[PDB]
Design an enzyme around this catalytic site. Structure first.
Site, PDB file in Angstrom:
ATOM      1  N   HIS A 160      24.094  22.336  37.190  1.00 47.11           N
ATOM      2  CA  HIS A 160      22.642  22.218  37.213  1.00 47.11           C
ATOM      3  C   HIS A 160      22.147  20.815  36.887  1.00 47.11           C
ATOM      4  CE1 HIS A 160      21.677  26.801  36.724  1.00 47.11           C
ATOM      5  NE2 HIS A 160      21.606  26.424  37.987  1.00 47.11           N
ATOM      6  N   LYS A 216      20.806  17.191  36.619  1.00 43.45           N
ATOM      7  CA  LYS A 216      20.078  16.330  37.554  1.00 43.45           C
ATOM      8  C   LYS A 216      20.060  14.926  36.971  1.00 43.45           C
ATOM      9  CE  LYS A 216      18.238  20.220  39.408  1.00 43.45           C
ATOM     10  NZ  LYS A 216      18.594  21.234  38.384  1.00 43.45           N
ATOM     11  N   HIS A 226       8.963  23.202  37.420  1.00 48.81           N
ATOM     12  CA  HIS A 226      10.413  23.215  37.494  1.00 48.81           C
ATOM     13  C   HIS A 226      11.029  22.338  36.410  1.00 48.81           C
ATOM     14  CE1 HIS A 226      14.441  22.468  39.386  1.00 48.81           C
ATOM     15  NE2 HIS A 226      14.297  23.724  39.773  1.00 48.81           N
ATOM     16  N   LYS A 250      11.886  21.655  32.512  1.00 43.82           N
ATOM     17  CA  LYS A 250      12.162  22.490  31.344  1.00 43.82           C
ATOM     18  C   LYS A 250      12.008  21.609  30.120  1.00 43.82           C
ATOM     19  CE  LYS A 250      14.947  24.138  34.828  1.00 43.82           C
ATOM     20  NZ  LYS A 250      14.584  23.691  36.190  1.00 43.82           N
TER      21      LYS A 250
HETATM   22  O1  LIG Z   1      18.099  23.311  40.280  1.00 46.44           O
HETATM   23  C1  LIG Z   1      17.611  24.352  39.784  1.00 46.44           C
HETATM   24  O2  LIG Z   1      16.970  24.277  38.704  1.00 46.44           O
HETATM   25  C2  LIG Z   1      17.789  25.709  40.468  1.00 46.44           C
HETATM   26  C3  LIG Z   1      18.917  26.521  40.297  1.00 46.44           C
HETATM   27  N1  LIG Z   1      19.050  27.699  40.904  1.00 46.44           N
HETATM   28  C4  LIG Z   1      18.073  28.153  41.718  1.00 46.44           C
HETATM   29  C5  LIG Z   1      18.200  29.408  42.373  1.00 46.44           C
HETATM   30  C6  LIG Z   1      19.312  30.238  42.233  1.00 46.44           C
HETATM   31  C7  LIG Z   1      19.416  31.118  41.165  1.00 46.44           C
HETATM   32  C8  LIG Z   1      20.524  31.946  41.054  1.00 46.44           C
HETATM   33  C9  LIG Z   1      21.527  31.906  42.010  1.00 46.44           C
HETATM   34  C10 LIG Z   1      21.421  31.035  43.085  1.00 46.44           C
HETATM   35  C11 LIG Z   1      20.314  30.207  43.195  1.00 46.44           C
HETATM   36  C12 LIG Z   1      17.181  29.852  43.205  1.00 46.44           C
HETATM   37  C13 LIG Z   1      16.037  29.083  43.405  1.00 46.44           C
HETATM   38  C14 LIG Z   1      15.908  27.860  42.769  1.00 46.44           C
HETATM   39  C15 LIG Z   1      16.934  27.399  41.924  1.00 46.44           C
HETATM   40  C16 LIG Z   1      16.779  26.153  41.292  1.00 46.44           C
HETATM   41  O3  LIG Z   1      15.806  25.488  41.451  1.00 46.44           O
END
Ligand SMILES: O=C(O)c1c[nH]c2c(-c3ccccc3)cccc2c1=O
Length: 438
Positions: A102, A104, A327, A329
């Site tokens: 995750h 970034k 988006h 946190k």
């Molecule tokens: O980078 C991030 O914070 C994100 C991480 N997972 C995301 C998912 C997702 C959640 C569970 C399983 C697969 C996909 C769906 C839609 C947006 C995100 C997202 O934005």
């Protein structure tokens, strides 16, 4: 400002609410430095879009994409990048089930130095269009002269801690970036790195990652004040994991306990959780599609209805972003009247055991499933006892911290519900005239 905390540009707000915001094209501009090479750590990538955000003269410089994709998703990402011969890929290992990459982050190597960017956006158009997202921009770090022997370390230990985070990947392409960082002077950094990496940590490693890393930093570098029990904890996130059958299982037993740590000495602390309601999403700039990036499933939610009594609406009049769904946190510790904060964290970590860690083996081991990264702002690192909260995010002493949403947070009304992405909303249409049918 000494904080270098920014929001992304939002299409559709008045110019005064984007004056001081940053688009990805701004971050990659030659005004920031003459690009030699870059690494893009992220979760989701649109490679065609991403290359277009680099300045034309920099679009053939090497780019490394650090991702967590496997099997067909991995093939799809390689197919996206194949047209670009200057792009290499690094698949971060995910040896624990249900983990994700995750984090970034951008590493930007210039002729003039090095820059680190830790942020909250995926590398796709929609994440930089009409969302509330956070960015921390490091200083321009100069190169250490060849032959000079200096640490290049900051009082917050950021250089060593970033190297430690990258070493956890065990990846050859990232050993190259570790060597770049060793060669630069990061001593001006005034934030602490808080990372998560997948694994099971005991003993000396217990405090390295996740919510135990946060606890360790708060114990060592923050001070407890009288009536600390009245200073709330605020958590603000875009996704919620399975936290258990009641609050004592994880949320208010180990997570909140780490978050309420202050100082080295040894609960009724109020806990505010900010998460968009259905009405927040419906009336947003994007409409219901904004809920595509707020992935709280009904299966998880129905097992923890106790949690929703903690939920507060998204409101951000201070930054003109009430209709720009979050988006970003963030986690912070405000004073009882919300006029000061004891610390502020911006991160990729959502409200989940996967991101923050959960204790195992009779409390001796912290198990983390995912990669996450954020930066912690502590008053002590700026010569202060507390931060005053900036009353208007974009207004004008530069030692007040720009909190991007409104305080105090507002509790859900009796008719409000948390956004749950995989059920239909057919009662009322969104700002584009549509319903939501998953
Ligand atoms: O980078 C991030 O914070 C994100 C991480 N997972 C995301 C998912 C997702 C959640 C569970 C399983 C697969 C996909 C769906 C839609 C947006 C995100 C997202 O934005």
């Amino acid at each position: 400002n000494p904080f270098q905390f920014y929001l992304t540009r939002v299409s559709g707000v008045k110019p005064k609410y984007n004056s001081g915001a940053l688009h990805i094209k701004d971050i990659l501009s030659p005004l920031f430095g003459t690009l030699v090479s870059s690494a893009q750590f992220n979760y989701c990538f649109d490679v065609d879009w991403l290359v277009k955000q680099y300045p034309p003269e920099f679009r053939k410089k090497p780019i490394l994409l650090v991702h967590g994709d496997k099997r067909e998703a991995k093939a799809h990402l390689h197919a996206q990048a194949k047209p670009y011969e200057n792009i290499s890929l690094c698949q971060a290992k995910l040896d624990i089930a249900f983990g994700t990459h995750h984090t970034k982050m951008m590493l930007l190597l210039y002729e003039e130095g090095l820059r680190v960017v830790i942020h909250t956006s995926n590398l796709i158009h929609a994440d930089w269009h009409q969302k509330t997202q956070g960015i921390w921009l490091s200083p321009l770090y100069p190169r250490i002269a060849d032959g000079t022997h200096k640490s290049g370390e900051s009082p917050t230990h950021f250089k060593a801690d970033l190297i430690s985070y990258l070493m956890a990947y065990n990846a050859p392409s990232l050993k190259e970036w570790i060597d770049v960082i060793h060669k630069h002077d990061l001593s001006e950094t005034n934030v602490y790195l808080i990372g998560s990496t997948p694994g099971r940590f005991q003993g000396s490693q217990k405090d390295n990652w996740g919510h135990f890393r946060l606890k360790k930093l708060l114990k060592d570098h923050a001070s407890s004040m009288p009536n600390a029990e009245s200073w709330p904890v605020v958590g603000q996130f875009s996704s919620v994991g399975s936290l258990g059958a009641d609050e004592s299982k994880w949320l208010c037993s180990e997570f909140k306990e780490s978050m309420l740590t202050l100082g080295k000495e040894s609960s009724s602390v109020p806990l505010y959780l900010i998460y968009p309601s259905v009405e927040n999403v419906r009336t947003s700039l994007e409409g219901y599609p904004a809920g595509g990036s707020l992935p709280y499933s009904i299966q998880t939610a129905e097992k923890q209805n106790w949690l929703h009594s903690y939920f507060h609406k998204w409101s951000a009049e201070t930054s003109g972003r009430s209709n720009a769904m979050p988006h970003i946190k963030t986690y912070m510790r405000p004073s009882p009247d919300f006029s000061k904060i004891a610390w502020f964290l911006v991160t990729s970590a959502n409200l989940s055991k996967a991101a923050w860690g959960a204790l195992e083996k009779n409390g001796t081991q912290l198990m983390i499933r995912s990669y996450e990264l954020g930066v912690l702002f502590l008053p002590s690192a700026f010569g202060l006892d507390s931060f005053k909260v900036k009353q208007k995010f974009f207004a004008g002493p530069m030692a007040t911290f720009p909190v991007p949403y409104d305080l105090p947070p507002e509790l859900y009304g009796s008719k409000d519900r948390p956004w749950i992405w995989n059920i239909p909303y057919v009662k009322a249409p969104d700002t584009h005239g549509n319903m939501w049918v998953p």
